[PDB]
Amino acid sequence: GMILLIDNYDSFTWNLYQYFCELGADVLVKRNDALTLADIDALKPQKIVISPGPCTPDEAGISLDVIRHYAGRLPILGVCLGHQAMAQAFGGKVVRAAKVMHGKTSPITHNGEGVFRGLANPLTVTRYHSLVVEPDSLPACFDVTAWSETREIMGIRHRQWDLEGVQFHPESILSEQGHQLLANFLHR
Amino acid sequence: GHMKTLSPAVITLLWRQDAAEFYFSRLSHLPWAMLLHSGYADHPYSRFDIVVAEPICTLTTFGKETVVSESEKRTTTTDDPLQVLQQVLDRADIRPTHNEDLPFQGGALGLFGYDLGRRFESLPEIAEQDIVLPDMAVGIYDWALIVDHQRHTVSLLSHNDVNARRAWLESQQFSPQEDFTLTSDWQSNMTREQYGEKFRQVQEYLHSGDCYQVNLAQRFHATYSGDEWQAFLQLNQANRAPFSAFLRLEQGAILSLSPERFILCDNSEIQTRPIKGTLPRLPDPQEDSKQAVKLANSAKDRAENLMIVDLMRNDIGRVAVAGSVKVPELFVVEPFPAVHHLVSTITAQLPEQLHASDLLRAAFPGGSITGAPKVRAMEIIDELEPQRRNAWCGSIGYLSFCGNMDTSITIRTLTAINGQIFCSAGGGIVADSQEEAEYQETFDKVNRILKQLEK
Ligand SMILES: N[C@@H](Cc1c[nH]c2ccccc12)C(=O)O
Ligand SMILES: [Cl-]
Ligand SMILES: [Cl-]
Ligand SMILES: [Cl-]
Ligand SMILES: [Cl-]
Ligand SMILES: [Cl-]
Ligand SMILES: [Cl-]
Ligand SMILES: [Cl-]
Ligand SMILES: [Cl-]
Ligand SMILES: [Mg+2]
């Protein structure tokens, strides 16, 4: 249906736009300071995607507020910063990774659930992040759906709601099965 | 009666390989005379040289204000400069069909300075504005001289009286001026120590997650005397760069030896070819072949290049037809006289409701000379670079009346103004970068230009 893609001033957001449009979605992109929660209510999106972006969830404009308000009401996907924001919105903590991964691919292992349904395991994904969700801090309401080779959280899923984060970029040219990963979110 | 969809009238002139430099010589002193030159490069995108002069309309942007000038009429506007440009193009009532042999059929040609990006994103004002040269300086031309190295044809096209334009051209006489001389040594706007401090601040932002790559540049300044066109003739021969240009502006001269295409729009087919990755050419040919292989397989450079590929997919993806964005080429090495460059190619399709000018607005300035994420990287560049970039790392090119566009990134580009000449050099800073190697790479990219002008 109609997807609202919240843009955290990012230079990867329109790759998500292109993938969702290719899959047949109607997509609106709005910057994280161009929208209020009242405007979202007027747009009546079917699903929301929180984009990647610089800095931390605290610098992600309306992103944390949207996650808290629409959690369990419309499906939400968080990508990279969006994934971090989703963890933070329910009490998680975002910390520096052991090693920054900027334009580097990694094999990740998942449980074949949520956006990983039907995907190969392991899966090679592009990373563009300096920060991760601290595993110790992760709220009880989330399962870890995917791990890096060094046991960093690469994905989370809310145990009740359609609320899912991935730390990597399915929309990167060197990510495996990125269209199908997003198709899982679009068509569930 | 008025609207013209008719193909322009064409006179074929005598074929000579040097036709563009030959004809441009007699125009090079005129404000709004402009040359796009393929550098005589052995290169897949070295086909055309384009010459224009005597515009019917000019657009000059300094900050918020664009001045549109026609023979006896001058208008000032704070509107989006690319919307103003599109309106001016539309109002010419010249609408020819695409021609594979005439990629520019008249239209807009000139400079989009890096600081024009301040019209499309809110950016801080820390770096000093010490060069007074327009953020946009574009002429509107109803004729062009096209040199085609593939067909070996020189075509003079005009939407008016092509025989009158040919007579005008053969009536201009080349009266050569004093040769170019540098009258000071080159000096940088930063010491090795200042470069280090800036480099280390970029590394802090990389580790904090503010950014993934930042293009950090220093600027070389000298005084000069004599004719900028004579300097360009020397530099063009030495650089063999396929996106070279000479612009004579009201305020000074831009001498571009860019090897880099920004955005092509060719019958609605979009191409961008970001350069990200460099190694110096080595004198021993066996060593130099090894050097090209080392670049192609460098883990650090392939990471930086991949990032800018994903970024250029995004920038083009703001307007591209859904499903049209492709990467036909990843990590190809192109050799230039000074350096090997790692180049990738992204393609897409422009929707019929949009214009090349809308694609330019969506993408400007190039991801390849800013970083990722782009807005954060431009904030950091403004924080650390002592002066605004002005013409450097903007774009030169054309928006044809047919809808076509081609643009460069103005790397390897000199600004010559008020007897001062400026030449900047940058590189991508990423987490694996080394401070001394990145300092030295800036010299590797322009040393041959600095040294050619010094004697
Ligand atoms: N190389 C381009 C023409 C060109 C030369 N210099 C340029 C500068 C900007 C844009 C285009 C150009 C071609 O063959 O078509
Ligand atoms: Cl917006
Ligand atoms: Cl930390
Ligand atoms: Cl690291
Ligand atoms: Cl300004
Ligand atoms: Cl310090
Ligand atoms: Cl580079
Ligand atoms: Cl390979
Ligand atoms: Cl450079
Ligand atoms: Mg490099």
Residue numbers in the entry:
A (entry chain AAA): 0 to 187
B (entry chain DDD): -1 to 453
Article excerpt on this structure:
Here, we chose aminodeoxychorismate synthase (ADCS) from Escherichia coli, which consists of a class I glutaminase subunit (PabA) and a synthase subunit (PabB), to investigate the mechanism of glutaminase catalysis regulation and its impact on overall GAT activity. PabB catalyzes the amination of chorismate (Cho) to 4-amino-4-deoxy-chorismate, which is a committed step in folic acid biosynthesis.
When Gln was added to the crystallization buffer, we found a glutamyl thioester (Gln-TE) adduct covalently bound to the catalytic aC79 within the glutaminase active site in only one of the two PabA/PabB heterodimers, indicating that under the given crystallization conditions the glutaminase reaction proceeded only to the Gln-TE adduct without performing the final hydrolysis step. This finding is most likely due to structural restraints imposed by the crystal lattice, in line with similar observations in other GAT structures. When Gln forms a covalent adduct with the catalytic aC79, as expected, the glutaminase catalytic triad residue aH168 is in a catalytically competent position, allowing a nucleophilic attack of water on the reactive carbon atom to reconstitute free aC79. In the ADCS structures with Gln-TE bound in the glutaminase active site, we consistently observed a distinct water molecule interacting with active site residues aY127 and aH168. Finally, the reactive carbonyl group of Gln-TE interacts with the main chain amino groups of aG52 and aL80, which together form the oxyanion hole required for glutaminase catalysis by polarization of its carbonyl group. We also found several interactions between the noncatalytic amino group of Gln-TE and residues of both ADCS subunits, including bG207 and bY210 from the PabB subunit, allowing the catalytic center of Gln-TE to be positioned with very high spatial precision, to generate a catalytically competent glutaminase active site arrangement at the PabA/PabB interface. Indeed, we found a rotation by approximately 23° in the principal axis orientation of PabA and PabB subunits induced by the presence of Gln-TE.
